[PDB]
Each structure stands twice: as C-alpha cells, then as structure tokens.
Amino acid sequence: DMPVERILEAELAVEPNDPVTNICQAADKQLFTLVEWAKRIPHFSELPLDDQVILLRAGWNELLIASFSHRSIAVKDGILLATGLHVHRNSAHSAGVGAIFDRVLTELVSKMRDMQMDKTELGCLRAIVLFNPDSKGLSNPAEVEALREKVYASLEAYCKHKYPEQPGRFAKLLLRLPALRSIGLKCLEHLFFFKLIGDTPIDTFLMEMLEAP
C-alpha cells in the first residue's frame, strides 16, 4: 500500500562570487525537482490539488534541506549543491551565514553519515515531512495523517528487516526531524531577509514560496 521500494524510486528519479547567491540558485532549481518528486510519492497525486499545494508550501524547506544534507555525506565540512558546486564551511561563514550552515553540518549531514542513512530512509523521512497533518488549511487532515502513518510503519518494518542488529535505528531517524524542523525555520528567516534587503538575486519559484501566506 505504501511500499518503500516505490519511495526509493522517487528519490532515484530525482538524482542529478557570493556563496548565498549560488545556494539560492540551487534552491530554485530543486523546487521544480521537488514538485516532480512529490508526485512519485504514492497517493500524493491522489490528494486534492489545493492540499498538494498546502503540503509542499509547508514543507519545501525541510524537504530540500534533507535532500542536500544526505547528498553531502562524503563531503568534508561542506555541502554539495544540486548545481554541482561544492560549498565549504569557511565559504558560508565568510558570506555571513556560518551559524546556520554549521547547524546543517552538525545536526544533519554529520548525523546522517555516522549511521550511514540509506536513500530509502531519507526518502521515508522526506515522505513523513511531506504528509504533515499539522499543515494549516488542509481540507481532510485525517487523510494526510493516515498517509503519514503508512510511511513510518513501512519505514519501521524496513528498518527491522534491513538493519535488525540496530534496534533503535527507527527512532534515531525520527529524532533528526525536530532538528530538520528547527533548521528549516531558520532558513526561511534568512531567505525572507535576503528578500527584504534585495542584495541577493532570487529566482521566480523561490520568490513564490516566500510570498504570503
């Protein structure tokens, strides 16, 4: 009903002077890819069109952040952007965004690497974030809650089977989500500020996610 093999295929179908300008460029590019990603997640396309909007608008940060963090596993003190460019710890710090960059590095990338999070687990965590019943405006929130329940039950059962020696790997995965949430909110703030000041080029799709509400 909610197969981890299908969620994995959604992830695999998606694989490709101012550092902040380069990071925002990569963000906009991935927003298009994210919409295509969401569709490949079982039952998401079957949700009403308005609810698909509400879901993607509420989680786009966390969804994108999870993606470039897992991509950056084999990177020393930095992140690999979707554009192909690497961005190092010092490059971001010198751009005046080192505090949040280090949070991404320490709380996600690093934590992902040490447990060697696979693409199926990354996909499931992303799918859990996607099916957020707490998203305001949702027409039928219980339907979105039920789809979340099906993703994590599949993820647990995937974990108990693929890594049966690590009895607490399931909870370990789920406990990166508050960090992702916290880091996601702090990104929005930054992005709102890059907008307010106007010293950073911001492409059309990224600009639309920064429009109200």
Partner: peptide, 11 residues
Amino acid sequence: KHKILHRLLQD
C-alpha cells in the same frame, strides 16, 4: 495565488 506551483502540479 501560487502561480508557478499550480502549473507544475498540473497533470
């Protein structure tokens, strides 16, 4: 409201 997103969620 959300122009680009709606157009991409189409089909």
